[PDB]
Write a protein that binds this ligand. Sequence first.
Ligand SMILES: Nc1ncnc2c1ncn2[C@@H]1O[C@H](COP(=O)(O)OP(=O)(O)OP(=O)(O)O)[C@@H](O)[C@H]1O
Ligand SMILES: Nc1ncnc2c1ncn2[C@@H]1O[C@H](COP(=O)(O)OP(=O)(O)O)[C@@H](O)[C@H]1O
Ligand SMILES: Nc1ncnc2c1ncn2[C@@H]1O[C@H](COP(=O)(O)OP(=O)(O)O)[C@@H](O)[C@H]1O
Ligand SMILES: [Mg+2]
Ligand SMILES: [Mg+2]
Lengths: 1622, 145, 48, 144
Amino acid sequence: MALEEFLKQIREVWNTYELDLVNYQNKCRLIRGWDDLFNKVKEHINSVSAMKLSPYYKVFEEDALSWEDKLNRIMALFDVWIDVQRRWVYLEGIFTGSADIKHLLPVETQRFQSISTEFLALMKKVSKSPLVMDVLNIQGVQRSLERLADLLGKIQKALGEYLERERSSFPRFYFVGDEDLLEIIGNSKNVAKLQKHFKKMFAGVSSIILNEDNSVVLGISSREGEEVMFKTPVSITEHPKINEWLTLVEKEMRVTLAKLLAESVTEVEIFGKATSIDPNTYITWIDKYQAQLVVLSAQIAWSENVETALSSMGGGGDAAPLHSVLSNVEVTLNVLADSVLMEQPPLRRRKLEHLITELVHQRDVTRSLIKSKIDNAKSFEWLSQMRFYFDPKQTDVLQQLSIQMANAKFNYGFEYLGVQDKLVQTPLTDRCYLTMTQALEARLGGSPFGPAGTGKTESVKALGHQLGRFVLVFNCDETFDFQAMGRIFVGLCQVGAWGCFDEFNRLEERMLSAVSQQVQCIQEALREHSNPNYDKTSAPITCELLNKQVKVSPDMAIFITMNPGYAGRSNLPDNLKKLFRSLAMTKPDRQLIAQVMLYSQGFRTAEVLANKIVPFFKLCDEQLSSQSHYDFGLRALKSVLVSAGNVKRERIQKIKREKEERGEAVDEGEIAENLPEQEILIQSVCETMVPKLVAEDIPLLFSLLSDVFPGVQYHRGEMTALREELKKVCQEMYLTYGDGEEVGGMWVEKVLQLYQITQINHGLMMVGPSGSGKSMAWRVLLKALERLEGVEGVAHIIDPKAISKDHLYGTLDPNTREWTDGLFTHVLRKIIDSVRGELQKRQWIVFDGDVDPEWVENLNSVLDDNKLLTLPNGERLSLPPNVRIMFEVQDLKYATLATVSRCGMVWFSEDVLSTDMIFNNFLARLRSIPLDESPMLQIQRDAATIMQPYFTSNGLVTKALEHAFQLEHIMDLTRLRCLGSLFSMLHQACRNVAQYNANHPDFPMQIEQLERYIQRYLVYAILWSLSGDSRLKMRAELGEYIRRITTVPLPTAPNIPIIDYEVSISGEWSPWQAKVPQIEVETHKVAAPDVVVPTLDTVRHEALLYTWLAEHKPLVLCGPPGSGKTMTLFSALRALPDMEVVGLNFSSATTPELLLKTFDHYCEYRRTPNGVVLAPVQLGKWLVLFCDEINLPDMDKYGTQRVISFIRQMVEHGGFYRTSDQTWVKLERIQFVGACNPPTDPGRKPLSHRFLRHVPVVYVDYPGPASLTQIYGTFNRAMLRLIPSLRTYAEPLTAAMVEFYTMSQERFTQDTQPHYIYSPREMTRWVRGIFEALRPLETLPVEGLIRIWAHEALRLFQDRLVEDEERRWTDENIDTVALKHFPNIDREKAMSRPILYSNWLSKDYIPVDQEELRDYVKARLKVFYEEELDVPLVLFNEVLDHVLRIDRIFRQPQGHLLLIGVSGAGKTTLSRFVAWMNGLSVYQIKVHRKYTGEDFDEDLRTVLRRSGCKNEKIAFIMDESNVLDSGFLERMNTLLANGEVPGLFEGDEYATLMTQCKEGAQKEGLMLDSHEELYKWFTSQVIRNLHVVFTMNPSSEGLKDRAATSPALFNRCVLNWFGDWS
Amino acid sequence: TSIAIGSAEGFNQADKAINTAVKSGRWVMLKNVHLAPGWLMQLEKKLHSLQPHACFRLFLTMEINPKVPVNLLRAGRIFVFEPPPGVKANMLRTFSSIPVSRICKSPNERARLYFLLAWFHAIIQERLRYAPLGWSKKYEFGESD
Amino acid sequence: KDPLFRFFEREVKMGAKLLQDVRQDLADVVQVCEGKKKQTNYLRTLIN
Amino acid sequence: KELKNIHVCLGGLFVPEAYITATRQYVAQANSWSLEELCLEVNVTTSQGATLDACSFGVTGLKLQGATCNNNKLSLSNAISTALPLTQLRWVKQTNTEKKASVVTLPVYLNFTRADLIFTVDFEIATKEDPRSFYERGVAVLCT
Ligand SMILES: Nc1ncnc2c1ncn2[C@@H]1O[C@H](COP(=O)(O)OP(=O)(O)OP(=O)(O)O)[C@@H](O)[C@H]1O
Ligand SMILES: Nc1ncnc2c1ncn2[C@@H]1O[C@H](COP(=O)(O)OP(=O)(O)O)[C@@H](O)[C@H]1O
Ligand SMILES: Nc1ncnc2c1ncn2[C@@H]1O[C@H](COP(=O)(O)OP(=O)(O)O)[C@@H](O)[C@H]1O
Ligand SMILES: [Mg+2]
Ligand SMILES: [Mg+2]
């Protein structure tokens, strides 16, 4: 009765729930309460889904479907209404607040007024009936929303020019994106909505402070909560314009800080020159003033104290008051150290740490001054230091403070910095400060360079924050062109902000050279601003930037951070390098960094710990094995030190908690004294360094820890509550859970280590070989953390290499300068916006793919302390604290140290996931998940029980797996490829049992029969899964090893291998030869494209392919070309009537676009409540994508094939990403089959191990001499039935064919020439050539048959030969082979010197005489001159042979020609002459200087339309010189093999083609109406009507290059080596 | 007029500067022309069919890249800039580049300071010819220093 | 436990693995130059 | 035990720096000292095969560039290279007794390219030679 109650609750909720409306400026009633509306739908949808689980759901199935439909409609309606309403709010303000937009953008205003009125019209309709059900039933409310969303988007992108004008009024808008700027201008009245954009315009201002009216800006606030109250609040009522009052806020910001600093300086002067300091008074002063002002006041007080002391020492022989300055610094430092030791508020604690860090530097400087005996204030030992001077008598508060270093004079910009992590002022930092300040005084830029993690960009920010400057970090890549960099400079010029362009060398060399012009003129403007003759009352300093006069603020500075020797970076031009002062930041003073940080964090043994941890990392670097994911630099030390402070705090907070529970004792001194600080440091080291360690390096580091830290042990605290959460999650996902040394204990430890890295680093990386448990580790943890903490976990899995870099991060339009978000940018921006509460969920962005510096260094700022995604359009996206950037990779061989140091590494060795864990997962899923979607489950449970003894450690499967690794295979062996193939085959065995039960309803299988079938099939499946991709000899070698070790009954044949036996459904071994009959092919079907002569190899492979195809498992056939992979696959597919196959030909230039175009033609995208589903157009049919050359696509310099990465993501994850709108598309009823040559063959690249994990591989070798005799002896027997007299010669005819083919295959190989590939395809053409000749003839003697046999051998094996001795060998051996297998014949009659056959002098194909042929060709050539081409030709014997070879190809379906020879040999002229005689129409593309890829596509469509729709035979003659781009061959490669191009006809071209195809089909009297039928007819017509002739020079390297760029040229085109004239 | 080659609009500024200078008689310098060898061939063709002003001069700055068109090298006059052969030549180049007025200012000791700077610069630059012994790597001790 | 044995064992491991790879590669080169085995993609690079 | 008393060619080692760290670890473990407290001192003996004490390790194949070593005293030489017969690397406690004003820290580069630095050796000068002159003449030590 509970199902009624749930429906009653849903019904009553939706009959009363009204849309909550709020009046908006007396214009309309906007909908409010978005989260509650969505959560109600989500919980009701889940409740209905839970209701579907109950067995009593059927009686209420119908009514729940209506509620399920209605809830989906409600969600879909308001999923768009939330975006439409939001876009209207800030668009209305822009088109109403500004009275000037109606003139600059008149038409855009007119569109909005029409759209606004319709939107306001829908306001009243919703307001009349606020009920959700009422507004859901509005006629066409959904479609009205989609148009409104679309139309509002059109106006949004049409405001780019208006926004650019707005950015000039407030220069800080240059760093705000277009959408955010529109929200800023539109929502000026709604100031409360502007608080999320202040972090993008100001260094430390996160929000502003307003009164209750929200009309006067009382002050500003930072992210940490620190607030600065304006001395004179800024009124928005008096300055309504957004840019006007924003400028006042910025101006009041500097004035308030300048006034507050003066008050802070006055107060801190009491602390200075004081022997004793009251801690209570000092803490009160610290809490009173802002963090940047407290540190600044201390610097001013210390510098004045030192300067006063040096002035007193100006007498030379006087005393040393510098000791008093050092004493005051030490007394102040002791108070700060004491305060940190006790508990402080988080804001005060950071202020104390900042004060300690600087006063340590002040103490060090004062000691240096005392040691070197400086008595003059003009001494460079004091001048080289940074000094602060305050002038209270200055009228301008902004000029009271002056910062001086060496001869460089600076003014504090008074930018509110909030609270920033101050760096330790190391000697390297002093060198950096000295060098960059010298560059600033010279008005040059700063160029700190060095390796990764040396603190270069942090030092630039620290120096900028030291001078009170606004420092902007830009992560530079190759997309920062001249316009993007110039616009950034324009913003920096007007704002007066520092530009820190990290990774500046990643720009293109031409871009770096072009940018140098903009840097040079900015510096010249800055230099002339420094002239004392210049007066600020005169014209302001301007510079030429992007053909405009841009004012240059004196506070601008340009800094570039570079790694010279790293990969993926360019070389800077010399004229650019002279504009920057370079400093080598190679060895950071890490010892001082550790000592100061630990001292500021409250460690009593900071000096001892720093002297221990700093060498420890150096020892680890020099002792541990060199691995690509190892980094023990400053970043690794920085993370350990930061963790040490966090671990100490939680331990102190922990110890206080037992003390208050156990008694009453809260003393900070006692806790600090009895605190194992040395244990704390090791805990941070273990939590950060151990996960990255390989198995062999763990003992080395632990030995290092014991020797560096003797007597100190680390016990990993058990994360108990997480472990039961992991155990429950692992149980539900059929995973193996273990504790410590149990099964799966290592994997659980890796999950726990991965959890610790999440709490420490925002950027994670999972490094480990394929099948190590990386994906399952983070998936289980994400779901377990959701249960443990109650926070929903959302994961965004991205394959960065399956798409281009433009589609991953975004692109800037070269013309309109409009930014389009990429895959990562759109995902990150959606989380940041938090329209649907993405900020309250745990967001994990996983990068599952290869990592190279081209794409991964764009995340350098994201993975850094900046936590910022900087785009070339000046927009920066702050990483939310709940977002983690995770990488799941198999290696880091190509990643640079810049990214390795930026992430926390967790290493997943292959021993982490043991084989028995995979066996447990397979058995658990088999016993639980039914295969059909229960009698099927019962079969699986019985089968799993039988297979349980074998699927154990050291069992049959494990031993067979270990032995198979010793044998070599056609592709690299992986554990999961064999296991994945084995598991799929066993699933077929269960389906076989279910089929038998259905076929025998009265007598199902018993236990005794099931054991026999399952045990025997397991051995059969083991043999074909481990040795499937190996040669025949090692298929028997595995079988011999199995026979030695297994106890399952096996065939008793003394010599027949087990691989030759199959398992009958009755549970008995049966030979495969029993299924191989001696068939009799029909005479008219001799060697037909679909006729298959059954052999031992064919029956075994078809059954193997059927098992894998029926499970919809991706699979690959490997072998030499022409082996029979395509033949075997299509034969096996004929046994599956519900699967349609689509052929794709891969080449070197193949990209995922080829797959996408096939999806467009054959599949459709549909909107579902679960997302986008891509399914074939035909319902109920499974689409099979047959890729024939998977290993040809070019692998880039970083070892990745994009199309392979596309398929791997689209096989493992069951879908891909549509780059049009950055949405996930899930495949349905789509299957993949691959074919390839061995990876050792030229032009073939080995497939990725990650790709090969999901794809079993079967090796199809060439048929043997016995098989060749059987296959073509049957064909010869059927073909020779035309002439009964010749039937006796069928056996010797096959023997001669086999022998000559074998001899030619051995004599000529790919070592000599790339095209010397001989396969059974040549044998098949040999049978067709004789059959086509014999067919017209009623009778023929034995000599005539041998002449036909010799003629076909010459055309098949000698036409492609290059050298004359190769052709002479073929001529001689043809005579010997014919004479041996056919004795006592008339050799002269059969082996006459010119073997020429032609159908020009007769009706049939009969031998022709050379003189008679010459006379006929001469007569035809005469007529050819007046009609087509008036170019005289000289007839010699080779031309007569060549025109016959061209004629024979032109008479065959899909007959393409590849003519190779020197230019001027007559290849084109003969082709045109023969095509004219054969009735073909010669087509040649008229290439020229401006010919492009689009013109080639137009020409291809013209040819296909004429030859496919108009039934016109066309001889498409193309030359290698006509190939102006690699896309020319890519289109030709697809057309040569399939006879069609998937993406050639799109849009109107496709519609026009179908119109022509319908007319063409009608003219043929064909009943074709559907588009699919018309296209199939169009493709068939093109195949039989279009002949392509390719002419190219006989180059050596070019011939091999064409073999990979256009594989169809050497597999579909008949190669005729014309060569040069002999 | 100085233009840095490498941007699409950089070619437009180069063409506009040359077109105006051949009539006005000004000087046009294009830097890093080796980064655009294809446009260099067009530039050489444009220069061949041209009758510029008597005072017009065009300077092309490159890095002795092997991809510089041969026809451009033959058409123009080549000047190779490299480290001076020795200490004596190094100091002569330094003293010539620095203006005479700069060395001779109010402090009479400025001249000796420049001489020491010239000698110091010459010594370290010549040590670069012996890569392992003079230094540890080929440092870029040039005019900017 | 001995650090010297740990280092010397590791040096032997890399040395033995590199020794086996180099000797196997040279043996394959001899076979190709003797016309007794087929040339692969990696062998073409190694021989070149 | 024999692994401690073998003479090791630093140039022939795959990772020479691991050996220096490994010898540092052995001395600290045997003498119950901390790793960071250990300091390296160099002693060149003409007689190869000389007995090594508990904390001395013999490394051979070192080449001295631009100088000759006699009685553990460095002297400037006009020869390109000078072979060091047997270099005894000894790990000792840090006594921070400052420099002797005749001690020069010579880099020990792996090879003649002077690209990778293994460690540094604190040799002492003989006679009236200038430590600046060693710096100016590029005096260094090469493993191979
Ligand atoms: N803890 C576990 N217990 C049982 N089976 C497991 C466990 N972890 C992983 N597996 C199984 O082992 C295989 C490893 O798959 P997984 O996705 O975890 O590997 P991976 O290292 O991420 O692989 P890849 O490099 O292909 O991304 C899968 O079949 C998975 O179901
Ligand atoms: N058992 C068989 N029966 C008939 N023909 C066969 C048999 N085995 C091989 N062949 C011949 O071998 C050729 C195989 O070529 P194909 O399958 O296209 O090679 P690939 O799959 O490598 O592209 C076919 O032309 C076919 O005639
Ligand atoms: N057998 C021949 N006798 C006389 N001239 C010939 C002969 N074959 C080719 N030519 C000459 O070659 C020219 C055409 O060359 P073409 O066939 O287009 O070169 P390619 O063979 O490279 O396509 C014609 O002008 C013709 O004079
Ligand atoms: Mg940086
Ligand atoms: Mg994975």
